[PDB]
Structure 1
Amino acid sequence: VRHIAIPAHRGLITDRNGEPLAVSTPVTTLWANPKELMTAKERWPQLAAALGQDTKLFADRIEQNAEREFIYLVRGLTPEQGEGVIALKVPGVYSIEEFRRFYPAGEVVAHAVGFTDVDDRGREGIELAFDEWLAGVPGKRQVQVTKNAKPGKTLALSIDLRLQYLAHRELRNALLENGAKAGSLVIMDVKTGEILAMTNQPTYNPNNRRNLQPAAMRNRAMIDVFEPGSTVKPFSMSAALASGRWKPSDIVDVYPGTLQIGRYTIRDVSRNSRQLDLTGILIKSSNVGISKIAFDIGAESIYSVMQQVGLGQDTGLGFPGERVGNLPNHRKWPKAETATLAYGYGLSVTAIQLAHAYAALANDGKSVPLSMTRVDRVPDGVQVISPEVASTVQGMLQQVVEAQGGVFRAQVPGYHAAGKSGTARKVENAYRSLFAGFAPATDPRIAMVVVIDEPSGLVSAPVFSKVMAGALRLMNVPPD
């Protein structure tokens, strides 16, 4: 008396509206009892042909495995083609009925959904992350069914497939139009912590993984870590405005675009300024300007805001090889390390962490935990920046996009947007174009990060413009 497992049907993955993203499809896996197959040798050439395998290769395989009470013949055969084998009616041939995944949206949501292995177990993305929820529990057969298989449970992602398609298309076009290698785009609901879209390029078809380059499989949004540069200056400014020592109309002299701190010299990307107000320091991305404010308030206040918005912290999503990056801490913050933290070369983050930090600022200073599954009851979340500072910083970022001298290519057709461009350094000196922002600026709903590796706020900003316009409309957000 022997036992054999009854495979359980893997749970359906849908997007947030019930659109199917991963579905367990019927297939048949033919095994055989060699010792039985060894009594029907004159059938072998027809079995071989019908199995795709080749006559002598097939005969060799069966002969050497003549002891084995059991061997597979083939996995994954369609159930109708698979009868064409049991239609030859060869002795020794027994069939198992099995499920295999199909991915109806294919390459569009490859990295977010991921895929299963040959054993129907999660290997990447959500398939891995919720493998236990989706897998259910195999059954048992001896005589009797000693245990009935329980089916895996349905899972509704936070992803909106309409926004994911728009993000996938617009990022793809931007990479060809800027001869760029790779890129990421993350869209978040700033109220719910939901990831509405996460697209990486290059992508792959999880329904055909034969010619699959490890480069295409890379979930860049959650894995690539970089120095966020000027895109974290809003968090430096949040610390400045919470200090009691700074208001937006305060002036800093940044002439002549350089600042010597001991042996080190801080050097601005544009060196045509003397007096700048705090908004101008952001618009110009003056490192001298943000450095002088950081020296006045202390790195500790900046470190604390960056920590509280989740920069360099575990996201809690449970995706495989999610990287945490690095928010370095000190007892004693010297001038050099204080400055480099304040203008964003003093830490490294992922696109997902950056978008989550921009969500907190956009959600009037309240952090909500990230979710890759549909949120029905919003968590309470944490007031990490006062609503008043958050409001002030939002208005500063709206000026960055829409003031004279600002990033005009991020302006969003129909709405007022807010955000900041940056030049990232990978973590031997690789460079990415960043844009981080949210909209609508006065009443934010969506936060977005665009990352474009090695293009060969002119590059990332127009992508943000186009994906944001489309996202706000698909979500029936009213024009301001």
Structure 2
Amino acid sequence: AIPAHRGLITDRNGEPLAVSTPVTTLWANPKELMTAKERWPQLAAALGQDTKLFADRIEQNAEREFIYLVRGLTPEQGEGVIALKVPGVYSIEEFRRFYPAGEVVAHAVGFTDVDDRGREGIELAFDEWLAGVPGAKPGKTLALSIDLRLQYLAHRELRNALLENGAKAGSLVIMDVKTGEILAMTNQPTYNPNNRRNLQPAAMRNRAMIDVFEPGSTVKPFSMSAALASGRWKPSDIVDVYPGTLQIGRYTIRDVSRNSRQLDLTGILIKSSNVGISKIAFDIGAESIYSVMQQVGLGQDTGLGFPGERVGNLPNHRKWPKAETATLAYGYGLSVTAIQLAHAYAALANDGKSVPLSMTRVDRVPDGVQVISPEVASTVQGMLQQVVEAQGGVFRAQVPGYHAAGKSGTARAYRSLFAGFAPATDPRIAMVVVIDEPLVSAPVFSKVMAGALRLMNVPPDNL
């Protein structure tokens, strides 16, 4: 079996992320080795192996005709060994993977097993494209959708934010709302795929795709989309939330800011009123809200074929009582990933058209599905822009130079969420920030979005 050169993984711009690099493996015929047995200690020594352990192995495999001595040496370490002229000690020309961007893109790229077979991330998800057949024809080059500049910016800013708010884990997703491309996907903690002899299993977790949480107030825009499509609600319509609590038989819904009476629909998002969103949910029914949430992909299969990727659960109760109707509308009757939430915000930002997710470079954009009507999506866009701009809004998420739109929330162990997109008047990027915890994340959205849009030469719309 003559191993094949493995396809190069680059980022969307050609920066190398996984490189098949030639190495020398030394193998040995044990039967031939029992012949040159006064040579073993020199072989053992030049292999870094204990003389008696080395002798025990050879003696143990005395029957066999093929064993490995060392895998993956550089071509002149193995050159030095066979230059010792030991009978029965030969060569096999293999390839080892090296990951030049290291821990910056570890979870997305993944890595190979000892036999150069895809074991995590893109390396696994596209193993057949990348492998090609042993002898021996070489695998195929793959350009990810990741932009290493945006990835590094997200990685650096997310790690800082965890160090600021004393947090341990978290993730950040950046998406092209127009093409479906995942421009950045970064997790903390992360790990160096070039030195994974010693890496904890918690840092191996691709949180953005695996960590499932109730998204809370971040799905209020979708509950509000259902409201605007029902035909019973215009943006300037009024809901009375006084006194910030609402009794549902036994349950009591409680707002965080209990300082309002009448709120228009934008006000319900600015103040993030569970009372107001529930009252609207009672009026329109949970079926409409479930439908928008399912249509934008919340709790649905992302279809990336990514290893480990989880789906969450959007339960289709078919008929919802009042309590489950409200708990769905303000985001605790479902479970999602950061990737699903970003895809949903992408659909909202892309004038209600959902373009399918892609972890590889998209040259020919597939046609999307109009999942939210363009009028409703553009209305909700304006409301979310008011959530960031307006008085009492999430000011720490404002992006200097541009108009940004978005929604904070608390996920549920809790996590701070910010989901948003920019620029508000011709959106290009959706972003989801997840910081695990024992408006933390709105500043990170601000920093990372400011840089991402500038890296993409997106002209300021705040003129």
What TM-score does the superposition give when structure 2 sets the normalisation length? 0.99
Deviations for 1:204-230, whole angstroms, at most 9, x for unmatched residues? 000000111000100000000000000
Structure 2 residue matching 1:227: 3-state secondary structure: coil
C-alpha separation in 2, matches of 1:34 and 1:229: 63
C-alpha separation in 1, matches of 2:59 and 2:440: 62
Q: Does 1:176 align with 2:163?
A: yes
In the TM superposition, residue 57 of structure 1 has moved relative to its aligned partner by: 1.1
Deviations for 1:155-182, whole angstroms, at most 9, x for unmatched residues? 0100000000000000000000111010
1:75-474 matched pairs, under 5 angstroms: 75-139=71-135, 149-425=136-412, 430-454=413-437, 458-474=439-455
Deviations for 1:240-272, whole angstroms, at most 9, x for unmatched residues? 011111011111110111111111111111111
C-alpha separation in 1, matches of 2:222 and 2:214: 14
C-alpha separation in 2, matches of 1:308 and 1:193: 15
Moved more, 225-234 or 28-37: 28-37
In the TM superposition, residue 331 of structure 1 has moved relative to its aligned partner by: 2.6
C-alpha separation in 2, matches of 1:88 and 1:8: 28
Deviations for 1:26-63, whole angstroms, at most 9, x for unmatched residues? 11111111111111111111111100101111111111
List alignment gaps of at least 5 residues for structure 1: 140-148
In the TM superposition, residue 356 of structure 1 has moved relative to its aligned partner by: 0.1
In the TM superposition, residue 198 of structure 1 has moved relative to its aligned partner by: 0.2
Deviations for 1:322-349, whole angstroms, at most 9, x for unmatched residues? 1100001113210001000000001000
Q: Partner residue of 1:475?
A: 456
C-alpha separation in 1, matches of 2:378 and 2:31: 77
C-alpha separation in 2, matches of 1:470 and 1:287: 33
Structure 1 residue matching 2:85: 3-state secondary structure: coil
Deviations for 1:422-472, whole angstroms, at most 9, x for unmatched residues? 0000xxxx00000000000111000000000016xx310000000000000
The alignment covers a number of residue pairs equal to 461
The answer to whether the 8 Å contact 2:287/2:319 transfers is no
Structure 2 residue matching 1:43: 3-state secondary structure: helix
C-alpha separation in 1, matches of 2:451 and 2:45: 52
Deviations for 1:377-432, whole angstroms, at most 9, x for unmatched residues? 1111101111111111000000000100000000001111000000000xxxx000
Structure 2 residue matching 1:167: 3-state secondary structure: helix
C-alpha separation in 1, matches of 2:29 and 2:2: 19
C-alpha separation in 1, matches of 2:232 and 2:63: 84
The answer to whether the 8 Å contact 2:298/2:314 transfers is yes
After the TM superposition, which parts of structure 1 deviate over 4 Å for at least 4 consecutive aligned residues? none
In the TM superposition, residue 71 of structure 1 has moved relative to its aligned partner by: 1.1
What TM-score does the superposition give when structure 1 sets the normalisation length? 0.95
C-alpha separation in 1, matches of 2:155 and 2:311: 25
C-alpha separation in 1, matches of 2:188 and 2:409: 20
Deviations for 1:1-49, whole angstroms, at most 9, x for unmatched residues? xxxx111111000100111110100111111111111111111111111
Deviations for 1:83-131, whole angstroms, at most 9, x for unmatched residues? 1101111111011010010101000000000000001000000000000
Q: Partner residue of 1:47?
A: 43
Q: Partner residue of 2:24?
A: 28
Structure 2 residue matching 1:6: 3-state secondary structure: coil
Aligned CA-pair RMSD: 0.7
Give aligned-pair identity as a percent.
100
C-alpha separation in 1, matches of 2:16 and 2:303: 25
C-alpha separation in 2, matches of 1:285 and 1:112: 33
C-alpha separation in 2, matches of 1:453 and 1:261: 30
The answer to whether the 8 Å contact 2:132/2:140 transfers is yes
List alignment gaps of at least 5 residues for structure 2: none
